[PDB]
Amino acid sequence: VRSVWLDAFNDPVAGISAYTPCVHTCNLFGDGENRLVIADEDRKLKIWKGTQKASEHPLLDTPVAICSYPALAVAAGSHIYIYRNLRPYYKFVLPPETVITCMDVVKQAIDEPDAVSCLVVGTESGRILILNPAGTAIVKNIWVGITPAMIAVQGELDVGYRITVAGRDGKLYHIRNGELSQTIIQLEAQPVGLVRLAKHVAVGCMNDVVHAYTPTGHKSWSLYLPCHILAMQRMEVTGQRNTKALIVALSNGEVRVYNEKLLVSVHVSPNPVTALWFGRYGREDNTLLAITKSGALDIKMLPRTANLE
C-alpha cells in the first residue's frame, strides 16, 4: 500500500559496494550497541557504528560473504579468516583440494539470539560443513552432488534443524537433521535469493517470481513481480506482532515487504538496493539497512505500533 517504515538516516556518499551476503550486523564490542559489518569490493572491510564510519580495514582477497558466531568470519577462496573482537585469530581451511560459494550460521542449542552458534559452509566441491561451536573443528560433513549457490538455515542444531540448498542447476535440495532429504524441487529459472520464512522457504527465480516451498515440496504461494529481483531478505519481527516477512528489492528501485503472501509495505530508494539487512543495529531492534547500487547507506526502522497483520 504505502511505506510502513520510519526514515532513520541516510548517507548518499558512503563508499559501500556489497551485495546481500557481505553485509551483516552483530555485537562485536559487546556493549549492546550493534555495528554494521561490510566486506566491500574495495577488498576492504568497512565498519559502521551508529551513523558514521568507525574503521576501514584491508582484506587479503575480495570476499564471498561474512557472518558471525562474537567473531566476524570472512570467507574467500579456501581460507576463512576468523577475526574476533576484532583482531585476527584463525585461518581455518577446507581439507581437500576446495572453494567456498556460500556461508551461514546454525544455532547450537538455544535457538535464541546471542546463543552458541556454529559456522556453516558450502564448498563448490559439493559438501556442507557444520563446525564446532568454537569454529576450530568440522562437526558434520554432508556430501550432496550439486554446486551450492545460496543456503538458508532454519532451526536449532541439537533440537532439530533443516537447511534448504539452492543449487546452481536450478534445483532445491533439503537437509533435515543432518540427513539429506530425497525431495528435490525443479525451479523454474535460476535462483537469485533464498529466505527462511515461517513455515516454508522462499526462492526468487531469475524470471521475477518468488516461490514459497514446503520441505515436503508444496507450493504455498507465488509472488509475481513487476521488475527484476536484486535482493531478498528475511524480516523477523518478534513480540506481539510476531511475523516472519519477506523483503524484496527490485531494480526498478522499490523495496517491498510481504507478510507471507500479502504486500505490506513498499518504498522506493533513489537507487536500486543491492544489499538488504534487517536486524538490530544501534539500539533499535527492527532496522532496515540498505546499500544502494550508488554506494549509499540507507537506514530505516519499523515503528513500534506498525501493523503487518
Binding site: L6, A8, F9, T51, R283, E284, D285, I299
Partner: protein, 166 residues
C-alpha cells in the same frame, strides 16, 4: 507544599534515570546508575512544589507502559541522547504517540537535549528540528541541553518547568 506529577520518558539509554539523580541531594545520589527495570517512582522537592517523579524504561519492551501514566501526568520531561542521531526519528515517533494519546493532557513538556558533553552531540536547534518541536503549538514546551553526569543544565530545565507549574 503543592504536589505535582512529572512523567519522565524518552528513549532507552538517554539519561532519564541519571538526570533525576542530579535532582537528589548530593549524599543521596547514586554512584553508578543502572538500566532502569520496568519503572520507578521517586520524589523530589523543589521550592513550594513537590515533584512525584515517574522514571520509566525506554526499552523497546517497556515503552508500552508510559500510557499507563499519561492520564495523571501534570508535566513531562522528554529525554534525548544528543549523540544518538540514529534513533532520532524513533524518539520522534514515540513523542508523537504520546502527544496524540487521548490520556496525555496539554501539560508542559521539557525536552532535555541530554549528553551535551559528547563530541558528536546534536545541537538543541538541530534536535528540535528532528522531533519537530516547532509544530507543537498548544503546550508550554522548552528544549534545554544538559549534562546529566554533572547536572549541568538540569537546574536550568527543572526551574523552567516549575515556573509553568505555579
Amino acid at each position: 507544599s503543592k504536589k505535582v506529577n512529572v512523567l519522565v520518558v524518552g528513549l532507552d539509554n538517554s539519561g532519564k534515570t541519571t538526570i533525576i539523580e542530579r535532582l537528589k541531594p548530593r549524599p543521596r545520589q547514586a554512584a553508578e546508575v543502572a538500566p532502569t527495570v520496568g519503572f520507578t517512582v521517586d520524589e523530589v522537592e523543589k521550592g513550594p512544589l513537590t515533584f512525584t517523579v515517574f522514571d520509566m524504561s525506554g526499552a523497546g519492551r517497556y515503552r508500552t507502559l508510559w500510557e499507563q501514566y499519561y492520564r495523571e501526568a501534570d508535566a513531562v520531561v522528554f529525554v534525548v541522547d544528543s549523540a544518538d542521531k540514529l534513533r532520532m526519528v524513533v524518539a520522534r515517533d514515540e513523542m508523537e504517540h504520546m502527544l496524540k494519546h487521548s490520556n496525555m493532557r496539554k501539560v508542559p513538556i521539557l525536552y532535555f537535549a541530554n549528553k551535551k558533553d559528547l563530541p558528536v552531540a546534536m545541537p538543541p536547534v538541530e534536535i528540535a528540528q528532528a522531533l519537530g518541536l516547532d509544530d507543537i503549538k498548544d503546550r508550554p514546551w522548552q528544549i534545554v541541553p544538559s549534562n546529566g553526569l554533572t547536572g549541568e543544565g538540569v537546574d536550568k530545565g527543572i526551574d523552567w518547568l516549575a515556573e509553568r507549574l505555579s
